[PDB]
Design a protein around this ligand. Structure first.
Ligand SMILES: Cc1cc2nc3c(=O)[nH]c(=O)nc-3n(C[C@H](O)[C@H](O)[C@H](O)COP(=O)(O)OP(=O)(O)OC[C@H]3O[C@@H](n4cnc5c(N)ncnc54)[C@H](O)[C@@H]3O)c2cc1C
Ligand SMILES: Cc1cc2nc3c(=O)[nH]c(=O)nc-3n(C[C@H](O)[C@H](O)[C@H](O)COP(=O)(O)OP(=O)(O)OC[C@H]3O[C@@H](n4cnc5c(N)ncnc54)[C@H](O)[C@@H]3O)c2cc1C
Ligand SMILES: N[C@@H](CCCC[NH3+])C(=O)O
Ligand SMILES: N[C@@H](CCCC[NH3+])C(=O)O
Lengths: 578, 578
């Protein structure tokens, strides 16, 4: 199908555009994106295998997935070490259990999974590990929305009183039509790519250098779409709770708008018991256990040594040597902090590591002695409230809908500058119990205003147990943010360098930022699968490369392999010294 | 002079553009930016004064400056309370003294002051308080610069080996000409404003909606300037250590490029003993002492009460009432966290508080048993090193140049995402002494690479005393960042609302973000002076308004007062209910 295909087609052609220019710089030529050299090695795709050992840096889901794939392939004489800087395994899969009562938790990192075709690799991993899935209610019943201290009202013009007609500055033609105006903006590029991808791709490249706000202000790479003034775009943004969208490349956002075009009523799932169940199941399966409290501070390769096992990492000032390949799966801010001089990375790959932008995210969960949002507010089916108050979005759990006693509320979920603001009130040294601090006081005050239709402040404060937990990902030194979120031009210009091997094809930058499915578990898993592919190719393990394709190829393959592919060319360009 | 005047002319006309549109919405008209109504009250500019009390929220430099002005005017029966949330007074004026030896400190907030005409109000405050000024060396001797693990070399083409000619991606025509290409970009708009401000202002408004990166990519609001590709702009950015410039409105950045056109060799000053000397001197002068540990959580006005003293604030759940005016001087993230429903602010003024962006900044200072950068590296005169390593910029103090024993180095000074990254390693619970943590280890490793021409890692580690301190402003709940840094369209569209009084002309949003001189002490001081002006006008204290103009008017006046002015019109539009 087309809507399922556009993102993979987009990624593959970005790689082709850059390979052609780089190829041309190698010989300089007539190489074009749709005319590149074929793979001279496809003619060919126990312990005749020499002993090899590989290093996996990081035990988040992508490092654990690499280990799971290697374990399943059972390559003779192949072993690995996996080093994790934190005392905790899982990375951005992170459930906080207040106690280990059934539902007494919240997820600090990933928590919901939509059932769309690009997520097949993710749901297969859930299947392999026996994850108990339940429905996640993205849209709920009776959730309040509060802006300009007015509640949303069905079938009312400008209920928040923010439009020019009511004395504000939001244009009357935008105030009640945000979702609609956004779906056109992109929708003009949806039908051009649908007519024919090659012509649509070229038209979309003229906005690849644009932010969302820039597109909406200028009306097209060509100027053929409606134009919006400052306050209209500000409102479209204010109504955007969630990850930053208006600072993303407009091209990327157009690609994103196909994601839910089977259409945007897929069901959503979460893991009963918390997403960390997945981590536990993965890490208990591994042949070689994760080594926690092992922060890599340097990675190198010794080009004077001709053997396969010529790479090393440094941990706590000690050298760990003998690796034939290193898979780095950390977020890029962590990788930028390492001493990578021993890898001789080319400058533009070094820039991608340093410059790609990460969005912040903060979560605040509070425990109440009963679920007053269910019992008193009629909020019986999950969903989320949104507001311009500091807590921005209050998420009603989908895993405790039938409980009648103590219950967790995800009272604030913020992104970007809102998350930095709440994060300033979050300390990893909790106050002396049961002192209430500034953050709790703020959240309770905001919750009472958001639920003022059915609750008082006194009644919410009375229901609060005194137990809460909060977490700000930009303040976690092992991650530095929620996830990559690429500015104008960054994806078209840097994704080719991030997907590329380095150090003679022996080093891989792996993880959600290295994939076009970035932001989600699927991006981590696909990037891991791709790195294992290139590793097997590097050492010409053709029998095991076939097994990888037969056993672990899910959904549409991001990496363009085969005969017309570019995988061999990304490998060569990453294997090239200088 | 023109170059001294452009920023004030720019600000005043932005106010006029918005007043004309709003005026027109009031009667709807023929009001234009250069045809607005005159002041009907200039015909007129002890205890015939009724007793009044005002509230100053925040004891940073702008709240202390308001109190200092009021103290000097000696208005009979006028008193004030000034409430400060922190246990510390000073705000973003913040010297950390490791001990109180002479030079044993670093400044966490403001530290250097250029002697340019727009800074006259600041140097007058230094004069009034007896500040001991010494030279601040912005450019030093022999400071290293390290990019792509190459050191800068005089008279060498592409010393960092990042250009297309040397296998990188930075265009050969940009790699060694960044400062030059930037000075043209703006320079095309410098000479249009110089020809005639009205025509230049209109041409500049066509880019007011643009970021710096957007301008450089598109080459002009008109497309008449050179255009730059992604990697050229990335490099111009990489070479930008300092506050974000490429995400500012291009208009604003053009205005900024006049700042140092007397020209850009003014001298710089710092305060010997730390900038907190200024705080101490100001706070010890006040008639009413700062009340610390008093965080305002709500501000209101009681419109049912006709008396002047009808405003209140809430602090720790207790009401403090009786105020005739409230000056809020906190950063806007703090003000957005308050319950301001009692003020009935109009939605667009509420949006400005919530949406204006703040840049992050982090500083890391280490003490060494001797100044090895002076003695061993020849870095004898201050300045700063720059690098693409995580510490980004290392600032050699200007206040310890003659010392031979223990000395402080400001080893890392970062902004934006670099500051968020270092900030993730900064905890306000210091590690158990004298354990070395991840941050110190990183800074020492980076310092040794930056100074590798004359130092070893072992020699720098040996000189380190084990004493350091670090601070990340985005993680301070009393501030939330270094300072406002306005995106595309934000200054033109929101500065008019921030300068405007509210609540019947009785509430003022004061501080560095409320001024066109924003980012600096001068912006805080000018915004404070402006708020006192509007307060005196509100209560028709014409004798004291004259004294304010005679005693406290320094430099060019930001606020357009007089007969053609707009001050009375900003007051009316802020006094209007609904
Ligand atoms: C707030 C939030 C909400 C999310 N919600 C969803 C969701 O609902 N659905 C979804 O599908 N995805 C979601 N995601 C995305 C998903 O969680 C991530 O894409 C994925 O978990 C990232 O995994 P990774 O292995 O690529 O990286 P990581 O999880 O970051 O793992 C990298 C590991 O490397 C370790 N490390 C770092 N430095 C070093 C070092 N020097 N030495 C050794 N180890 C090191 C880190 O400690 C970490 O364990 C969310 C993410 C966030 C932040
Ligand atoms: C890293 C950095 C470097 C700088 N360098 C320079 C420089 O070299 N030169 C220069 O001229 N300027 C510099 N500045 C800018 C200058 O420091 C600021 O412009 C100025 O100090 C801001 O003062 P203010 O009074 O506007 O705000 P603030 O200093 O933020 O003061 C506001 C006060 O309000 C308090 N407060 C907050 N919330 C509440 C509440 N709810 N109730 C009561 N009180 C509250 C805060 O604690 C604070 O004390 C720098 C700033 C930073 C961050
Ligand atoms: N995947 C994450 C983040 C999505 C928002 C990205 N800007 C979630 O489900 O919340
Ligand atoms: N005024 C501050 C910040 C300037 C950079 C602004 N982006 C200083 O001297 O460092």
């Amino acid at each position: 199908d087309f809507a399922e295909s556009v993102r993979t087609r987009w990624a593959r052609r970005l790689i082709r555009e850059k390979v052609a220019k780089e190829l041309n710089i190698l010989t300089e030529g007539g190489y074009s994106h749709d005319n590149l050299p074929s793979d001279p090695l496809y003619s060919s795709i126990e312990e005749e295998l020499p002993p090899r050992k590989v290093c996996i840096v990081g035990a988040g889901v992508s490092g654990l997935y690499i280990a799971m794939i290697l374990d399943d392939l059972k390559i003779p004489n192949l072993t690995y070490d996996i080093f994790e800087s934190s005392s905790r395994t899982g990375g951005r899969l992170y459930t906080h259990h207040f106690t280990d009562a059934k539902h007494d938790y919240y997820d600090i990192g990933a928590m919901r999974y939509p059932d769309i075709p690009s997520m097949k690799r993710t749901f297969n991993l859930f299947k392999r590990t026996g994850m108990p899935l339940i429905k996640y209610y993205l849209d709920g019943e009776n959730t309040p929305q509060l802006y300009n201290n007015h509640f949303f009202a069905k079938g009312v013009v400008d209920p928040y009183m923010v439009s020019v007609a009511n004395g504000g500055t939001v244009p009357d033609d935008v105030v009640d039509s945000v979702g609609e105006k956004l779906q056109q903006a992109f929708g003009y590029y949806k039908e051009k790519l649908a007519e024919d991808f090659d012509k649509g791709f070229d038209e979309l490249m003229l906005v690849d250098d644009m932010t969302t706000r820039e597109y909406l202000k200028r009306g097209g790479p060509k100027g053929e779409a409606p134009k919006y003034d400052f306050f209209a775009i500000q409102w479209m943004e204010t109504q955007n709770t969630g990850t930053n969208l208006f600072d993303q490349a407009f091209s990327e956002s157009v690609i994103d708008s196909f994601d839910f075009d089977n259409p945007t009523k897929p069901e959503w799932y979460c893991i009963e018991g918390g997403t960390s169940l997945l981590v536990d199941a993965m890490k208990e399966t591994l042949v070689h256990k994760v080594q926690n409290n092992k922060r890599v501070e340097a990675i190198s390769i010794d080009l004077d040594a001709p053997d396969d096992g010529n790479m090393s990492v440094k941990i706590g000032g000690k050298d760990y040597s003998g690796y034939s390949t290193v898979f780095n799966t950390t977020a890029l801010g962590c990788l930028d902090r390492m001493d990578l001089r021993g890898l001789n990375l080319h400058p533009t790959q070094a820039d991608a590591i340093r410059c790609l932008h990460y969005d912040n995210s903060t979560k605040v969960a509070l425990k109440f002695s009963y679920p007053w949002w269910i019992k008193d507010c009629g909020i019986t089916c999950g969903g989320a409230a949104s507001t311009d108050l500091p807590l921005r979005t209050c998420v009603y759990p989908s895993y405790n809908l039938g409980d009648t006693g103590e219950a967790v509320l995800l009272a604030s979920y913020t992104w970007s500058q809102d998350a930095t603001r709440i994060g300033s009130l979050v300390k990893d040294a909790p106050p002396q119990p049961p002192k209430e601090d500034e953050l709790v006081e703020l959240i309770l005050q905001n919750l009472a205003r958001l639920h003022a239709e059915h609750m008082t402040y006194e009644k919410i404060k009375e229901a609060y147990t005194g137990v809460y937990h909060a977490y700000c990902w930009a303040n976690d030194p092992n991650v530095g943010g929620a996830f990559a979120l690429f500015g104008p031009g960054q994806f078209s210009n840097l994704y080719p360098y991030l997907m590329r091997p380095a150090a003679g094809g022996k080093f891989h930058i792996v993880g959600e930022a290295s994939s076009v499915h970035h932001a989600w578990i699927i991006g981590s898993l696909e990037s891991a699968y791709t790195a294992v592919y290139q590793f097997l190719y590097k050492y010409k393990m053709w029998d095991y490369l076939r097994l990888l394709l037969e056993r672990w190829q899910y959904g549409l393959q991001e990496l363009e392999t085969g005969k017309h592919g570019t995988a061999h060319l990304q490998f060569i360009l990453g294997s090239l010294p200088k």
